[PDB]
Short mmCIF file of C-alpha atoms in Angstrom, two decimals:
data_model
loop_
_atom_site.label_atom_id
_atom_site.label_comp_id
_atom_site.label_asym_id
_atom_site.label_seq_id
_atom_site.Cartn_x
_atom_site.Cartn_y
_atom_site.Cartn_z
CA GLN A 1 -0.04 -0.12 -0.23
CA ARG A 2 0.77 3.73 -0.92
CA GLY A 3 2.57 5.08 2.37
CA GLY A 4 3.32 2.67 4.34
CA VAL A 5 5.87 0.17 5.53
CA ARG A 6 8.62 -0.73 3.07
CA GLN A 7 10.32 -4.22 2.04
CA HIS A 8 14.24 -4.99 2.42
CA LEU A 9 16.44 -8.10 0.13
CA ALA A 10 17.98 -10.69 0.86
CA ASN A 11 21.80 -11.97 1.05
CA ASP A 12 23.92 -14.50 -0.54
CA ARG A 13 25.99 -17.97 -0.08
CA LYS A 14 29.67 -18.88 0.73
CA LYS A 15 31.33 -22.10 0.29
CA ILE A 16 34.81 -23.86 0.56
CA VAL A 17 36.27 -27.03 0.71
CA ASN A 18 39.79 -29.09 0.47
CA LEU A 19 40.64 -31.79 -1.65
CA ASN A 20 43.83 -34.36 -1.28
CA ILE A 21 45.87 -36.05 -4.03
CA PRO A 22 46.91 -39.58 -4.35
CA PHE A 23 50.42 -40.81 -4.98
CA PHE A 24 52.14 -43.32 -7.90
CA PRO A 25 55.14 -45.46 -8.24
CA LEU A 26 56.95 -47.81 -10.32
CA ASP A 27 59.99 -49.53 -10.33
CA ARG A 28 61.95 -52.46 -11.98
CA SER A 29 65.25 -53.75 -11.42
CA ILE A 30 67.62 -55.72 -13.16
CA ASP A 31 70.24 -58.88 -13.04
CA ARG A 32 73.04 -60.66 -14.30
CA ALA A 33 71.13 -64.22 -15.14
CA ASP A 34 68.84 -62.91 -17.21
CA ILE A 35 71.17 -61.49 -19.78
CA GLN A 36 74.35 -64.43 -19.51
CA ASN A 37 73.89 -67.07 -22.23
CA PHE A 38 70.94 -66.42 -23.91
CA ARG A 39 70.23 -64.77 -27.50
CA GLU A 40 69.63 -61.65 -28.53
CA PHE A 41 66.53 -63.18 -29.18
CA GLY A 42 65.52 -61.06 -32.71
CA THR A 43 68.76 -62.07 -34.45
CA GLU A 44 70.46 -65.30 -35.55
CA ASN A 45 73.79 -65.53 -32.92
CA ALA A 46 74.39 -62.25 -31.53
CA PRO A 47 74.42 -62.17 -27.70
CA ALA A 48 72.32 -60.58 -25.29
CA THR A 49 72.88 -56.60 -24.65
CA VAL A 50 71.61 -54.69 -21.43
CA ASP A 51 70.52 -52.06 -23.09
CA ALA A 52 68.14 -54.06 -25.43
CA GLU A 53 66.53 -55.10 -22.00
CA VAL A 54 66.26 -51.15 -20.84
CA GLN A 55 65.08 -49.65 -23.64
CA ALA B 1 37.26 -38.95 1.77
CA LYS B 2 34.60 -36.72 2.84
CA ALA B 3 36.38 -33.22 1.80
CA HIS B 4 36.27 -30.75 4.75
CA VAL B 5 34.37 -28.23 4.06
CA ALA B 6 33.22 -24.75 5.73
CA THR B 7 29.93 -22.39 4.64
CA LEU B 8 28.61 -19.01 5.47
CA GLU B 9 24.86 -17.59 5.22
CA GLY B 10 23.89 -14.31 6.51
CA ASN B 11 25.29 -11.03 7.23
CA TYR B 12 24.94 -8.07 10.27
CA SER B 13 22.45 -6.30 8.48
CA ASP B 14 19.90 -8.63 8.36
CA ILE B 15 18.67 -8.44 11.78
CA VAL B 16 19.17 -4.37 12.24
CA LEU B 17 17.67 -3.10 8.77
CA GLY B 18 17.34 1.09 9.61
CA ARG B 19 17.86 3.14 12.56
CA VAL B 20 16.69 6.54 13.50
CA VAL B 21 20.17 8.00 12.86
CA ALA B 22 20.31 11.16 15.91
CA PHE B 23 22.26 14.24 14.72
CA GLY B 24 23.69 14.73 18.29
CA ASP B 25 24.05 11.16 19.26
CA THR B 26 25.34 7.99 17.63
CA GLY B 27 24.64 6.07 20.31
CA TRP B 28 21.11 6.26 21.43
CA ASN B 29 19.87 3.04 20.10
CA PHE B 30 21.89 0.98 21.18
CA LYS B 31 22.44 -0.18 25.10
CA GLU B 32 25.39 -2.17 26.71
CA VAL B 33 24.78 -4.73 29.39
CA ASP B 34 26.50 -7.87 31.53
CA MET B 35 25.78 -11.17 30.37
CA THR B 36 27.25 -14.56 30.66
CA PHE B 37 29.34 -15.75 27.70
CA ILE B 38 30.42 -19.18 28.37
CA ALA B 39 27.53 -21.39 30.52
CA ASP B 40 28.36 -21.07 34.42
CA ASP B 41 28.91 -24.98 34.60
CA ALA B 42 30.19 -25.88 31.27
CA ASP B 43 33.62 -26.21 30.59
CA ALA B 44 36.76 -23.59 28.67
CA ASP B 45 36.63 -24.75 25.29
CA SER B 46 32.81 -25.23 24.99
CA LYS B 47 31.31 -22.81 22.14
CA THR B 48 29.07 -20.07 23.66
CA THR B 49 25.16 -20.97 22.76
CA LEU B 50 24.61 -16.87 22.74
CA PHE B 51 23.39 -16.32 18.52
CA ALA B 52 22.46 -12.79 17.24
CA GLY B 53 18.45 -12.43 17.37
CA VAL B 54 18.33 -14.19 20.75
CA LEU B 55 16.08 -11.94 23.21
CA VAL B 56 17.47 -10.25 25.72
CA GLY B 57 15.60 -9.43 29.35
CA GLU B 58 17.17 -5.41 31.56
CA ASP B 59 19.70 -7.92 32.81
CA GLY B 60 21.86 -9.75 30.43
CA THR B 61 20.04 -12.93 31.46
CA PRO B 62 18.09 -14.14 27.58
CA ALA B 63 14.41 -14.35 28.11
CA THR B 64 12.70 -17.80 27.12
CA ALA B 65 9.22 -16.30 28.05
CA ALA B 66 7.53 -12.92 26.48
CA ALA B 67 7.36 -11.11 29.89
CA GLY B 68 11.41 -10.16 30.08
CA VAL B 69 12.00 -9.32 26.44
CA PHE B 70 13.55 -5.75 26.36
CA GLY B 71 16.00 -5.94 23.58
CA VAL B 72 17.98 -7.73 20.76
CA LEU B 73 21.40 -8.68 21.12
CA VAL B 74 23.42 -7.39 18.30
CA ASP B 75 27.11 -7.60 19.53
CA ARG B 76 29.54 -7.84 17.03
CA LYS B 77 31.50 -11.18 18.66
CA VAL B 78 28.81 -12.97 17.66
CA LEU B 79 28.39 -12.86 14.11
CA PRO B 80 28.28 -15.36 11.22
CA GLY B 81 31.85 -16.30 10.65
CA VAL B 82 33.05 -14.03 13.89
CA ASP B 83 34.43 -17.31 15.99
CA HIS B 84 38.23 -16.90 17.20
CA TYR B 85 36.50 -17.23 20.85
CA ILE B 86 36.39 -21.02 21.40
CA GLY B 87 38.05 -20.63 25.05
CA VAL B 88 38.86 -17.20 25.82
CA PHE B 89 37.04 -16.55 28.58
CA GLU B 90 36.64 -19.14 31.37
CA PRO B 91 33.43 -20.45 32.38
CA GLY B 92 31.09 -18.18 34.40
CA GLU B 93 32.73 -15.34 33.15
CA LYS B 94 30.81 -12.30 31.84
CA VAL B 95 31.36 -9.94 28.80
CA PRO B 96 30.29 -6.49 28.24
CA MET B 97 27.60 -6.79 25.23
CA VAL B 98 25.13 -4.66 22.83
CA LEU B 99 21.70 -4.42 22.59
CA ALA B 100 19.61 -3.21 20.13
CA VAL B 101 17.02 -0.88 22.41
CA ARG B 102 15.07 1.60 20.59
CA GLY B 103 14.71 3.61 17.06
CA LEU B 104 15.66 0.40 15.17
CA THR B 105 13.63 -1.80 12.85
CA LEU B 106 14.03 -5.30 13.61
CA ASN B 107 13.56 -8.89 11.08
CA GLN B 108 11.03 -11.02 12.81
CA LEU B 109 12.65 -13.83 10.89
CA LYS B 110 15.68 -14.36 12.83
CA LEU B 111 14.43 -12.54 16.63
CA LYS B 112 14.33 -16.27 18.51
CA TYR B 113 13.95 -16.71 22.24
CA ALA B 114 16.84 -18.29 24.09
CA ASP B 115 15.82 -22.04 23.30
CA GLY B 116 14.85 -21.45 19.56
CA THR B 117 11.96 -20.81 19.94
CA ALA B 118 10.22 -18.38 17.22
CA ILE B 119 8.94 -14.80 18.55
CA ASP B 120 5.08 -14.78 19.64
CA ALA B 121 2.77 -12.06 19.26
CA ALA B 122 3.44 -11.26 22.87
CA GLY B 123 6.97 -10.85 22.91
CA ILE B 124 6.27 -8.66 19.58
CA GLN B 125 4.02 -6.42 21.06
CA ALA B 126 5.83 -5.86 24.20
CA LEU B 127 9.29 -5.72 22.01
CA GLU B 128 7.49 -2.86 19.75
CA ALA B 129 6.57 -0.66 22.87
CA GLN B 130 10.14 0.42 22.99
CA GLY B 131 9.83 2.08 19.67
CA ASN B 132 10.85 -0.48 17.02
CA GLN B 133 9.27 -1.94 14.13
CA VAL B 134 9.13 -5.36 13.56
CA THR B 135 8.52 -5.81 9.69
CA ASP B 136 8.36 -9.28 8.28
CA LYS B 137 7.73 -8.56 4.60
CA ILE B 138 11.29 -9.95 3.43
CA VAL B 139 12.10 -10.46 -0.04
CA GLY B 140 14.42 -13.62 0.50
CA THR B 141 16.32 -15.28 -2.05
CA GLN B 142 16.37 -18.32 -4.15
CA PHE B 143 19.46 -19.54 -5.69
CA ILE B 144 20.34 -21.89 -8.81
CA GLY B 145 18.28 -24.79 -9.61
CA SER B 146 15.02 -22.48 -9.43
CA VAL B 147 13.39 -21.77 -12.65
CA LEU B 148 12.17 -18.49 -10.97
CA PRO C 1 4.64 7.99 -10.30
CA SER C 2 6.95 7.13 -7.72
CA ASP C 3 4.85 8.11 -4.73
CA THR C 4 7.50 11.15 -3.99
CA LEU C 5 6.78 14.60 -3.42
CA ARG C 6 9.23 15.41 -6.19
CA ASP C 7 7.34 14.21 -9.00
CA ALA C 8 4.08 12.78 -7.33
CA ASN C 9 2.61 13.97 -10.39
CA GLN C 10 4.26 13.88 -13.26
CA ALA C 11 4.72 11.73 -16.32
CA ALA C 12 5.45 7.67 -14.42
CA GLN C 13 8.43 5.69 -15.43
CA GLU C 14 9.03 2.60 -15.31
CA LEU C 15 11.64 2.02 -12.33
CA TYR C 16 13.03 4.72 -9.85
CA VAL C 17 16.40 3.32 -8.06
CA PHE C 18 17.93 5.71 -5.02
CA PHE C 19 20.66 5.91 -3.21
CA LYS C 20 21.62 7.47 -0.46
CA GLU C 21 24.91 7.68 1.74
CA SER C 22 24.15 8.81 4.82
CA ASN C 23 26.22 11.69 5.56
CA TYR C 24 27.83 10.94 9.25
CA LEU C 25 29.70 7.95 7.62
CA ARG C 26 28.37 5.28 9.39
CA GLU C 27 24.93 3.60 7.39
CA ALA C 28 24.06 4.23 3.63
CA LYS C 29 20.69 2.70 1.89
CA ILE C 30 18.78 1.21 -1.67
CA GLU C 31 15.77 2.22 -2.50
CA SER C 32 13.92 1.40 -5.58
CA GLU C 33 10.19 2.03 -6.43
CA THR C 34 8.26 0.91 -9.05
CA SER C 35 4.03 0.43 -10.10
CA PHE C 36 2.41 -0.87 -12.91
CA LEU C 37 -1.39 -3.25 -13.50
CA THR C 38 -1.45 -5.40 -16.98
CA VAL C 39 -4.65 -5.27 -18.35
CA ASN C 40 -6.13 -7.66 -20.66
CA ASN C 41 -9.21 -5.80 -22.27
CA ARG C 42 -10.44 -9.45 -24.53
CA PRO C 43 -10.88 -12.04 -22.17
CA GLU C 44 -13.56 -13.70 -24.37
CA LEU C 45 -10.37 -14.35 -27.42
CA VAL C 46 -8.35 -16.70 -24.91
CA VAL C 47 -9.04 -20.48 -24.69
CA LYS C 48 -7.23 -23.07 -22.84
CA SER C 49 -6.69 -26.69 -23.97
CA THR C 50 -6.56 -29.22 -21.57
CA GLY C 51 -4.49 -32.26 -22.40
CA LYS C 52 -5.35 -35.73 -21.69
CA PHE C 53 -3.01 -38.30 -21.68
CA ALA D 1 41.18 -13.23 28.83
CA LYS D 2 43.28 -15.69 27.50
CA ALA D 3 44.95 -15.51 24.48
CA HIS D 4 45.46 -17.93 21.29
CA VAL D 5 48.40 -19.74 21.08
CA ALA D 6 49.83 -22.75 18.82
CA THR D 7 53.52 -25.07 19.31
CA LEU D 8 54.93 -27.41 17.40
CA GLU D 9 58.14 -29.28 18.33
CA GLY D 10 59.79 -32.36 16.58
CA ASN D 11 59.76 -33.99 13.05
CA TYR D 12 60.14 -36.84 11.24
CA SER D 13 63.19 -37.39 12.01
CA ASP D 14 63.40 -37.49 15.37
CA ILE D 15 61.91 -40.41 15.67
CA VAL D 16 63.41 -42.04 12.63
CA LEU D 17 67.42 -41.38 13.31
CA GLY D 18 68.50 -43.76 10.54
CA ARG D 19 67.97 -45.99 7.87
CA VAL D 20 69.34 -48.52 6.06
CA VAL D 21 69.08 -47.63 2.01
CA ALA D 22 68.72 -50.52 -0.13
CA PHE D 23 70.00 -50.15 -3.47
CA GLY D 24 67.64 -52.36 -5.53
CA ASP D 25 64.60 -51.45 -2.82
CA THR D 26 63.58 -47.94 -1.07
CA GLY D 27 60.83 -49.45 0.34
CA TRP D 28 62.01 -52.21 2.04
CA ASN D 29 62.15 -51.06 5.30
CA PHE D 30 58.40 -50.23 5.30
CA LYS D 31 55.08 -52.30 5.49
CA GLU D 32 51.91 -50.95 4.92
CA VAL D 33 48.67 -52.02 7.54
CA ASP D 34 45.39 -50.90 8.04
CA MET D 35 44.18 -48.76 11.59
CA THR D 36 40.93 -47.58 12.33
CA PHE D 37 41.81 -43.93 11.99
CA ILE D 38 38.67 -42.63 14.40
CA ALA D 39 37.36 -44.67 17.19
CA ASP D 40 33.72 -45.99 16.29
CA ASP D 41 32.55 -44.58 19.49
CA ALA D 42 33.76 -41.38 18.92
CA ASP D 43 31.72 -38.23 18.30
CA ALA D 44 30.76 -37.62 14.92
CA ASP D 45 33.35 -35.92 12.84
CA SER D 46 36.20 -35.99 16.33
CA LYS D 47 39.97 -35.84 16.36
CA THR D 48 41.65 -39.00 15.70
CA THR D 49 44.05 -40.16 19.19
CA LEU D 50 46.81 -41.63 17.11
CA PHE D 51 50.31 -40.50 17.50
CA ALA D 52 53.75 -41.24 15.76
CA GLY D 53 55.24 -43.93 17.49
CA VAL D 54 52.39 -45.90 19.16
CA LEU D 55 53.55 -49.48 18.99
CA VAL D 56 51.18 -52.02 17.00
CA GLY D 57 50.88 -55.34 15.58
CA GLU D 58 50.86 -57.04 12.11
CA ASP D 59 46.86 -57.06 12.13
CA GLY D 60 47.31 -53.41 13.06
CA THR D 61 45.89 -53.09 16.26
CA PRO D 62 47.64 -50.63 18.72
CA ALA D 63 50.09 -53.27 21.17
CA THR D 64 49.18 -53.26 24.95
CA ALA D 65 52.19 -55.82 25.34
CA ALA D 66 55.32 -57.30 23.95
CA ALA D 67 53.55 -59.87 22.32
CA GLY D 68 51.34 -57.44 20.07
CA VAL D 69 54.55 -55.52 18.78
CA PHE D 70 55.81 -56.33 15.61
CA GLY D 71 56.21 -52.36 14.35
CA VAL D 72 56.26 -48.80 14.27
CA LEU D 73 53.86 -46.42 13.41
CA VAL D 74 55.69 -43.81 11.22
CA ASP D 75 52.81 -42.52 8.95
CA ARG D 76 52.84 -38.99 7.39
CA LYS D 77 49.06 -38.50 8.81
CA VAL D 78 50.03 -38.40 12.57
CA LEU D 79 53.37 -35.89 13.09
CA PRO D 80 53.06 -33.04 15.28
CA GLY D 81 52.69 -30.28 12.44
CA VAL D 82 50.30 -31.90 10.47
CA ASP D 83 46.69 -31.14 10.60
CA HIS D 84 44.40 -32.25 7.35
CA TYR D 85 42.03 -35.15 8.72
CA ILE D 86 39.16 -33.68 10.78
CA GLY D 87 35.99 -35.59 10.21
CA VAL D 88 37.80 -36.93 7.02
CA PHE D 89 37.30 -40.98 7.90
CA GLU D 90 33.86 -41.74 9.77
CA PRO D 91 34.01 -43.01 12.33
CA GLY D 92 34.96 -47.03 12.32
CA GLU D 93 36.62 -46.31 9.18
CA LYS D 94 39.76 -48.57 8.04
CA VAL D 95 42.94 -46.20 6.07
CA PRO D 96 46.40 -47.45 5.05
CA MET D 97 48.83 -46.78 7.46
CA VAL D 98 52.74 -47.11 6.69
CA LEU D 99 55.00 -48.48 9.16
CA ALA D 100 58.27 -49.25 9.73
CA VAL D 101 60.38 -53.29 10.88
CA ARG D 102 62.98 -53.40 9.17
CA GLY D 103 66.75 -52.01 8.77
CA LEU D 104 66.12 -48.72 11.31
CA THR D 105 67.96 -47.54 14.24
CA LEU D 106 65.03 -46.11 15.92
CA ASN D 107 64.52 -43.69 19.13
CA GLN D 108 63.71 -45.23 22.14
CA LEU D 109 62.84 -42.53 24.27
CA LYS D 110 59.68 -41.62 21.49
CA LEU D 111 58.00 -44.83 21.21
CA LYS D 112 54.48 -45.44 23.25
CA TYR D 113 52.01 -47.97 24.59
CA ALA D 114 48.33 -48.01 23.05
CA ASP D 115 48.15 -46.10 26.96
CA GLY D 116 50.38 -43.80 26.63
CA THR D 117 53.26 -45.60 28.90
CA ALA D 118 56.66 -45.62 28.43
CA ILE D 119 58.36 -48.96 26.25
CA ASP D 120 59.45 -51.70 28.34
CA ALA D 121 62.54 -53.84 27.79
CA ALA D 122 60.36 -56.75 26.32
CA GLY D 123 58.83 -54.64 23.71
CA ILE D 124 62.11 -53.79 23.08
CA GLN D 125 63.72 -57.16 22.61
CA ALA D 126 60.95 -57.75 20.36
CA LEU D 127 61.71 -54.90 18.19
CA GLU D 128 64.59 -55.69 17.84
CA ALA D 129 64.90 -58.92 17.56
CA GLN D 130 63.12 -57.79 13.85
CA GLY D 131 66.51 -56.45 13.10
CA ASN D 132 66.24 -52.96 14.50
CA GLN D 133 68.45 -50.56 16.88
CA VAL D 134 66.76 -49.45 19.82
CA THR D 135 69.40 -46.11 21.18
CA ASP D 136 68.87 -43.98 24.01
CA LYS D 137 71.95 -41.94 23.20
CA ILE D 138 69.85 -38.50 22.72
CA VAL D 139 71.99 -35.34 23.48
CA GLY D 140 68.20 -33.22 24.53
CA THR D 141 68.49 -29.66 23.83
CA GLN D 142 68.89 -26.61 26.44
CA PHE D 143 66.72 -23.51 25.48
CA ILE D 144 67.13 -20.41 27.39
CA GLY D 145 67.08 -19.48 31.32
CA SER D 146 69.55 -21.93 32.45
CA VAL D 147 73.66 -21.10 31.41
CA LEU D 148 74.40 -24.22 29.80
#
């Protein structure tokens, strides 16, 4: 109604949060026995080499 | 792993919506009282049960009945997001508190008795005698999800 | 009109917005006023249809 | 009125003084178990009561006497200066925890039993049999007020 009381406004919301993170390892080793007398399997006669397994 | 979450709703200017600001003085509307902050039987680390809008009588004891309503607590230590007073005061300690008394416009959605009850008609009529406007008539808000 | 002595009998306007900063540097306020009526002069020409499924 | 103060003393290295590093495997010394992070009777989103150094059995339950001692709790989640996990885990839930059981130079003073009692001789013997050194040769520290 004209001349009477007015109205008033409201307010908004706020929020906050936190989070963690996981971890993923991976590893392998190399031993002498894996290369001693085994051929380079992809060829006729060449002996096995360490780098061929590292790669 | 439910995340640690914090929130906020509401400001100071939601119980107090306007004054009759006096020229000569600015403290005309307010009054100071001494109230028990931490219950005098609980422990130090207990958080205070006082909240903005809780009715207070002439003495510093929030009222649960119409016959003792005097003012509305609007102290700055109990506003949203202000909490850093865990354990600052020993149980049974008394702190000076501010009360709105006269010359103010008050929202009745937030006025409540000490136990959490809403303000009844008798409480309103007892608070208007001080010279206060009890509005209601508030727009509110609707957030995402509502079509409007 | 806006129901204000400044223009109580002038031509109306769609929306009034007042920003009043109180001089003594302790409070401020925003006010807004609008008034209008919507009229459907020919209700006979609108037909509603209920859909049955 | 009291003031708010927080303090921090001690680190990870103060419990694990020395470690034997195996060239071909870095995780040799440690073993994972599962533990009840929040006691099943704890209030909704309480604070945990585990701490670094508490002796636990292989099952994961904290040990009360020598027979139940298998390793030392050394997880990152319980170091003195860390606080993230409040209410993150529901009461009675279990989360993997890291123990250290092989090849360590362990402090003797920091290790505690489930109830906070200091480590006895039988527990020391049981922990040593696994292949761990228990030594109390710790210099200590003096801060102020005493002419060192």
